């Protein structure tokens, strides 16, 4: 049911003191299924998720290889970019990327993805036809010429239209227990008043799996927003998430409404109700 | 499975 595998590449570079740090994490739909890191915090404690071990040293050994050779290729990058904009060797800069493919459950490739970002600012991206580039500024135009000549587009597509795909369905198969799964919501609301007449009735949560947990302070029938002071979802630590919104209704028209949630796996909506339960 | 990026920007 709609699947997407993408990698988040990161070549943050440290100047002189040490070496450039290279991070490459993998996701499937949103499941971090592997993490590589130049700073191997303890011998290969590089998280690998459960359904990738059955891939003998064969897969991981070949995979761990690709990483190194890439980190060497984005060593060049970091120093070319520094050259394009002419920046001292003293500074520290960042090269990020997201490449991965989305497919329909039937197994066919819908779109290809591959973007880069230097210092946080989009630099160059592979277009939707997977055969052209879209340069941000005049520097990336230098890169573009480079890859147009190098046929780099072709190479990236070859991957996204093959290995990327031919390993997505596979990752979904082997690890179906976690990928094509859901999770129990759990959202214990709370009262908690404050000063005079303007109080608060924030909900809460124990998490789920994604985070699209839509906590809206409704208002009769029209989705209320202004009367809301909601804060961003701040995971939790036990591999779950939270979030809470803070409605400020009077002590006379208090429970003139109840907060909802809505989720994934669960069949019909679980329209919640604020009321000491 | 990672991509074999051979050419830098």
């Amino acid at each position, epitope marked *: 049911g709609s699947h997407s595998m993408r990698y988040f590449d990161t070549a943050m570079s440290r100047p002189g003191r040490g070496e450039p740090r290279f991070i490459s994490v993998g996701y499937v739909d949103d499941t971090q299924f592997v993490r590589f890191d130049s700073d191997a915090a303890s011998p290969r404690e590089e998280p690998r998720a459960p359904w990738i071990e059955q891939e003998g040293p064969e897969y991981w050994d070949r995979n761990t*290889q690709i990483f190194k050779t890439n980190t*060497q*290729t984005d060593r060049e990058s970091l120093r070319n970019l520094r050259g394009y904009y002419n920046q001292s060797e003293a500074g520290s800069h960042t090269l990020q990327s997201m490449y991965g493919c989305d497919v329909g459950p039937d197994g066919r490739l819908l779109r290809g993805h591959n973007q880069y970002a230097y210092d946080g600012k989009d630099y160059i991206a592979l277009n939707e036809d997977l055969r052209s580039w879209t340069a941000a500024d005049t520097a990336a135009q230098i890169t573009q010429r480079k890859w147009e000549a*190098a046929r780099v587009a*072709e*190479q990236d597509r*070859a991957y996204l239209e093959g*290995t990327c795909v031919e390993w997505l369905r596979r990752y979904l198969e082997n690890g179906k227990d976690t990928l094509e799964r859901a999770d129990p919501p759990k959202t214990h609301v709370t009262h908690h008043p404050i000063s005079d007449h303007e109080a608060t009735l924030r909900c809460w949560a124990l998490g789920f799996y994604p985070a699209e947990i839509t906590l809206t302070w409704q208002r009769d029938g029209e989705d209320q927003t202004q009367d809301t002071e909601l804060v961003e979802t701040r995971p939790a630590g036990d591999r779950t998430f939270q979030k809470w919104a803070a409605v400020v209704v009077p002590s006379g028209e208090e429970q003139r409404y109840t907060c909802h949630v809505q989720h994934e796996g669960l069949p019909k909506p679980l329209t919640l109700r604020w009321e000491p339960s | 499975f990672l991509r*074999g990026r051979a050419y830098g920007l």
Partner: T-cell receptor, first 106, second 112 residues
Framework: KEVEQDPGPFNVPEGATVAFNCTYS??????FFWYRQDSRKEPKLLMS???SGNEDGRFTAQLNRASQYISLLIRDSKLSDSATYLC????????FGQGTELSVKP | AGVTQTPKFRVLKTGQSMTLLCAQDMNHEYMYWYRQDPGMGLRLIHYSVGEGTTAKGEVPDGYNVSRLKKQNFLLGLESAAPSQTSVYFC???????????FGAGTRLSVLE
């Protein structure tokens, strides 16, 4: 093993055409390269395959990544084409192939 | 213009010292030092992905190497001895382990 290439001296007639076969154990390989080494000198890049199939111009390169097949096609052979034709597979860190000789007979 | 590799030929007495020069013009960040024996495949000795740095492939031997400057890769044989009697190809090229460009090659014969 790793990269499995053709046997020995193939003696293709002049005007005729030739096809080579190269195979790779690592199924998840990436890019491929047909080099040409004139006995006895340096490998000169001839063909490169980043996708499924590459032409340009008298040389063709068919790549089925499913069956793991990469082939070289040399139509309208010249007596000059005679040389060892290395096959190179990238994926991971670029492994060379022993090679495949080839003597065009006049 | 091209990838120059000097010298073409050279005779060595075991224990003597020589150093092969491989210099390039294309501004390639990537260079390579390969060894090829008669009928035997291409063997990777060292490689450098930049103006410093260096790596493996088949090093445990009388091969060391320097990328002091970017234009050229030097292969040095401290104390020569068989093997090391072969033909060497240095190679460069933009892109990491992709298309590469070899020089004429150096035919080495070190004799007892």
């Amino acid at each position: 093993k790793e990269v499995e290439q053709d046997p020995g001296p193939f003696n293709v007639p002049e005007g005729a055409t030739v096809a080579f076969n190269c195979t790779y154990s690592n199924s998840a390989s990436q890019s491929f390269f047909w080099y040409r080494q004139d006995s006895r000198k340096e490998p000169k890049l001839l063909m490169s395959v980043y996708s499924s199939g590459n032409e340009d111009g008298r040389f063709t390169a068919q790549l089925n990544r499913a069956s793991q097949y990469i082939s070289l096609l040399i139509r309208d052979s010249k007596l000059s084409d005679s040389a060892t034709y290395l096959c190179v597979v990238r994926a991971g860190k670029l492994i060379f192939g022993q090679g495949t000789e080839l003597s065009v007979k006049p | 213009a091209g990838v120059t590799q000097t010298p073409k030929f050279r005779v060595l007495k075991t224990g003597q010292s020589m150093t092969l020069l491989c210099a390039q013009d294309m501004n390639h960040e990537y260079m390579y030092w390969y060894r090829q024996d008669p009928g035997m495949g291409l063997r990777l000795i060292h490689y450098s992905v930049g103006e410093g740095t260096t790596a493996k492939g088949e090093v445990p031997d009388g091969y060391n190497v320097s990328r002091l400057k970017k234009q050229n890769f030097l292969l040095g044989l401290e104390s020569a001895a068989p093997s090391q009697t072969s033909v060497y190809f240095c190679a460069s090229g933009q892109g990491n382990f992709d298309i590469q460009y070899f020089g004429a090659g150096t035919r080495l014969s070190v004799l007892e």
